[PDB]
A paper describes a structure:
Despite relatively low overall sequence homology, PX domains all possess the same core fold, consisting of three antiparallel β-strands (β1-β3), followed by three α-helices (α1–α3). Side chains of residues from the β3 strand, α1 helix and PPK loop together form a binding pocket for the headgroup of the canonical lipid PtdIns3P.
We have also obtained two crystal structures of SGK3 and SNX23 (for which previous structures exist), as well as a crystal structure of SNX15, the crystal structure of SNX32 (in complex with a peptide from the bacterial IncE peptide) and the NMR structure of SNX25. When the secondary site is present with an intact canonical binding site then both PtdIns3P and other phosphoinositides can promote membrane association, which will likely contribute to overall membrane avidity.
Residue numbers in the entry: 6 to 119
Write the structure that this text describes.
């Protein structure tokens, strides 16, 4: 079927002198569903790759460079919203959800999903 996606939540991880937010993406294709876990940088690489290959789609992603606390929960919430709208637009077009970089991002061809 035509895939459906959402980004319901995010989680903070830390290592030493370091933190990062991990976005939980629910991906549904047909009668099945799974979880993909993506950092903003992973959305961004995809956005940059596809904005060049599909200019007229006027792809939009939330801001990359933040002047302020990039771990403000208000900020992360707005960012998640923007990323959700980003990917949810991606899966509307078969030109996109048959794109290899998109299918890998959402793990649409992993053998683990049967």
């Amino acid at each position: 079927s035509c895939p459906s996606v959402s980004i319901p939540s995010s989680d903070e991880h830390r290592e030493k002198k370091k933190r990062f937010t991990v976005y939980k993406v629910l991906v549904s294709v047909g009668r099945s569903e799974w979880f993909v876990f993506r950092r903003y940088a992973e959305f961004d690489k995809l956005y940059n790759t596809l904005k060049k290959q599909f200019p007229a789609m006027a792809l939009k992603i939330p801001a990359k460079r933040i002047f302020g606390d990039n771990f403000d929960p208000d900020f992360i919430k707005q960012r998640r919203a923007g990323l959700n709208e980003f990917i949810q637009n991606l899966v509307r077009y078969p030109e996109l959800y048959n794109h290899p970089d998109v299918r890998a991002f959402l793990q649409m061809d992993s053998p683990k999903h049967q």
